């Protein structure tokens, strides 16, 4: 469910509202943990793939107009 | 580095022949030769390769689905998984699958046309780290997949085939947007004397070994053209320096120049030629004074006004004329302050023309001896040479009558030029020999082809 994705990433936005950059950087680099991850890189990637859906939605629908 | 649209890079497959070891590039010579094959580009030693025919040009890495609408009728970054338009720059017979029996998987072949599904190849990298829809890096492995026959690209071990087996194919860099006034290798240009460097057009028992500067119309001649190869395989086409080392392939006969200190300096067959023996390089003036500079090769030497003299490395000798008008060209430290190599780039058309003419001379001969071979027993590259003929016929025809006079006339100038060019070697006379060898028959020998 695409709606779940919506909801999920809205959730993620809610992690960051109020602009807690310490938290945003910590999401960027995860310093307390020995491991490191940049979540946001990945959401970008989601944006990529959804975009690519958008694109193929274009390359199909554009030829049919309506 | 990113590999963008509109760039020259070859497809270097890691083609060990199931044992050892050659790093041969993909190649197909173009005119008269639809069928694909394979050429070395890694043996940079006593047996030098043939780089000129491998030079594919990047074109259109459009989306698969995007292709679908363009079918229904400019420096975009290359990305994985797109169908890609590709080229043999020499022929502009764009790389493509075609329907032939060369075991049910159709062979790749170079159609001229920008039409159709044939000329497009979606990429499916084995590395998920580089998922489809990701920028190509220099030298990256990939398995092309036909958009047309939907076959995977493959190396049939030698035989080439679009099969379900999956050979990888690297994009080895050559050049990225040459600027005028900035000399490049893999890129033909005249070596001027003030009049320019050239060799005898006889193409006879005198195996063009003689080497001469010469003025007048010989400068237009193909024989006065030279395809420089910098001593690099990657970025061979990157902009030249007055110092960086380089091979000197001849254009009209394809021969590498090399260190025959006998006759000072002279042409040699592309078999004796050595990466060492050819180690010529440019210099600003007679002077005895980092490398390689990959990623673009900095702009420097002019296509025109600037001089450069070619100091050699294996002998260290400077090139110079030895003294009807046929001043020579030979290696020793002095000569005189007048080698006058104010280098200038060769025209596109000149080069394809020329290289094609070498392809043609390179093809008829074995055909000739092979037809002549059963003349000894009264009672064989046939169809490929027929292809060469109809190719030249195409290459050589009149402008459309249904055209504006200006383009008719200009195109006619192209015709006149091209005819003159192929006439410069007179291979036509080899054709005359052919005809002499043939029509002895009433119908006959061989009784099959």
What are the DSSP calls for B57-119, one per residue?
Answer: EEEEEE-HHHHHHHS----PBPBTT-EEEEEETTTT----B--------PPBB--S-S-SGGG
A56/B65 touch (CB, cutoff 8 Å), yes or no? yes
Question: B304 — contact with chain A (CB < 8 Å)?
Answer: no
- For residue B345, list its beta bridge partners: B189
Chain position carrying tokens 């030895």:
B322
Locate B11 and state its tokens.
């497809």
Q: Cα angle at B45 between B40 and B51, to 5 degrees? A: 35
Strand partners, B39: B25
CB half-sphere exposure, B279, CA atoms < 13 A: 11
Task: Enumerate helices (H) and strands (E) in chain A, giving the number of each.
Answer: 3, 0
Known binding residue A3? Answer is no
With an 8 Å Cβ cutoff, are B65 and A62 in contact?
no
Method used experimentally: cryo-EM
Data resolution in angstroms? 5.7
- Chain A residues with CB under 8 Å of B130 CB are none
Q: Which residues of B touch A62 (CB under 8 A)?
A: 69
Q: Within 10 Å of residue B429's Cβ, how many Cβ atoms?
A: 11
Contact check, Cβ <8 Å, A63/B69: yes
- Bridge partner list, B283: B309
Q: Are the beta carbons of B137 and B3 closer than 8 angstroms?
A: yes
H or E element that contains B352: helix B348-373
CA distance B107 to B414: 34
A52: which chain B residues are within 8 Å (Cβ-Cβ)? 133
Which has the closest alpha carbon to B281: B254, B300, B296? B300
Distance from CA of A18 to the nearest CA of B (A): 34
Nearest-angstrom CA–CA distance, B344 and A17: 63
Angle at B327 between CA B321 and CA B331, to 5 degrees: 25
**Which ranges of B376-426 does DSSP label H, i.e. alpha helix?**
382-395, 405-425
- CB contacts of B72 in chain A (<8 Å) are 63
Angle, vertex CA B150, rays to CA B148 and CA B156, nearest 5: 105
| Helix or strand (DSSP H, E) at B310 | strand B309-312
Give the A:B interface size as CB pairs under 8 Å: 16
Phi/psi of residue B319, nearest 5 degrees:
-75, 145
Strand partners, B79: B135
| A55 and chain B in contact, CB less than 8 A | yes
Find tokens 């043609």 and name the residue.
B360
The tokens for B66 are: 């995007």
Q: Nearest C-alpha of chain A: how many angstroms from B117?
A: 17
Q: What are phi and psi of B226, to 5 degrees?
A: -140, 125
Q: B51 with B31: CB under 8 angstroms?
A: no
Return the closest-CA partner of residue B318 out of B304, B308, B305. Answer: B308
**Cross-chain Cβ contact A59/B63 below 8 Å:** yes
In residues, how long is chain B? 449
Contact A55 B65 (CB under 8 A): yes
Cα–Cα distance, B127 to B238 (Å, whole number): 29
Residues 6 or more apart in contact with residue B136 via CB below 8 angstroms: B2, B3, B78, B79, B80, B142, B171
Exposed / middle / buried, residue B383 (Cβ in 10 Å: 0-12, 13-18, 19+) = exposed
3-state secondary structure (DSSP) of residue B409: helix
* B interface test, pick of A52, A57, A62, A65 with most B CB neighbours within 10 Å: A52
User: Which one, of B193, B118, B185, lies nearest residue B346 by Cα?
Assistant: B185
Distance, CA of B123 to CA of B152 (rounded, Å): 9
Backbone angles phi, psi at B373, to 5 degrees: -60, -35
Give yes or no for a contact between B425 and B362, defined as CB atoms under 8 angstroms apart. no
The token pair that represents B327 in the structure block: 């001043």
């Amino acid at each position: 469910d695409d709606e779940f994705t919506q909801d999920l990433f809205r959730f993620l936005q809610l992690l960051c509202e109020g602009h807690n950059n310490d938290f945003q950087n910590y999401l960027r680099t995860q310093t307390g943990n020995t491991t490191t991850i940049n979540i946001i890189i990945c959401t970008v990637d989601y944006l990529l793939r959804l975009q690519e859906s958008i694109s193929d939605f274009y390359w199909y629908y554009s030829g049919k107009d309506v | 580095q990113f590999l963008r649209t509109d760039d020259e890079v070859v497809l270097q497959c890691s083609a060990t022949v199931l044992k050892e070891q050659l790093k041969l590039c993909l190649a197909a010579e173009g005119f008269g030769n639809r069928l694909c094959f394979l050429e070395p580009t890694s043996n940079a030693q006593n047996v030098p390769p043939d780089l000129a025919i491998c030079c594919f040009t990047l074109e259109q890495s459009l989306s698969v689905r995007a292709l679908q609408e363009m079918l229904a009728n400019g420096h975009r970054t290359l990305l994985y998984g797109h169908a890609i338009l590709l080229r043999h720059a020499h022929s502009r017979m764009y790389l493509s699958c075609l329907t032939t029996s060369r075991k049910l998987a159709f062979d790749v072949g170079l159609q001229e046309d920008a039409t159709g599904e044939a000329c497009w190849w979606t990429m499916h990298p084995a590395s998920k780290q580089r998922s489809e829809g990701e920028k190509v890096r220099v030298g990256d492995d990939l398995i092309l997949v036909s958009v047309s026959s939907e076959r995977y690209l493959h190396l049939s071990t030698l035989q080439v085939d679009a099969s379900f087996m999956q050979t990888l194919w690297n994009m080895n860099p050559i050049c990225s947007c040459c600027e005028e006034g900035y000399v490049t290798g893999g890129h033909v240009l005249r070596l001027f004397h003030g009049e320019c460097l050239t060799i005898s057009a006889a193409d006879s028992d005198d195996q063009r070994r003689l080497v001469y500067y010469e003025g007048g119309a010989v400068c237009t001649h193909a024989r006065s053209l030279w395809r420089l190869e910098p001593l690099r395989i990657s970025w061979s086409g990157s902009h030249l320096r007055w110092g960086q080392p380089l091979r000197i392939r001849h254009v009209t006969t394809g021969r590498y120049l090399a260190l025959t200190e006998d006759q000072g300096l002279v042409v040699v067959d592309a078999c004796k030629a050595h990466t060492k023996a050819t180690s010529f390089c440019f210099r600003v003036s007679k002077e005895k004074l980092k490398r390689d500079v990959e990623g673009m090769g900095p702009p420097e030497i002019k296509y025109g006004e600037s001089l450069c003299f070619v100091q050699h490395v294996a002998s260290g000798l400077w090139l110079t004329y030895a003294a009807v008008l046929k001043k020579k060209a030979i290696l020793h430290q002095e000569g005189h302050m007048d080698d006058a190599l104010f280098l200038t780039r060769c025209q596109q058309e000149e080069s394809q023309a020329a290289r094609m003419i070498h392809s043609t001379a390179g093809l008829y001969n074995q055909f000739i001896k092979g037809l002549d071979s059963f003349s000894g027993k009264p009672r064989l590259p046939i169809e490929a040479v027929i292809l060469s003929l109809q190719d030249l016929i195409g290459y050589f025809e009149p402008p459309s009558e249904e055209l504006q006079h200006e383009e008719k006339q200009s195109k006619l100038r192209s015709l006149r030029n091209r005819q003159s060019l192929f006439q410069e070697e007179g291979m036509l006379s080899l054709v005359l020999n052919c005809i002499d060898r043939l029509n002895v028959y009433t119908t006959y020998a061989g009784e099959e082809a």
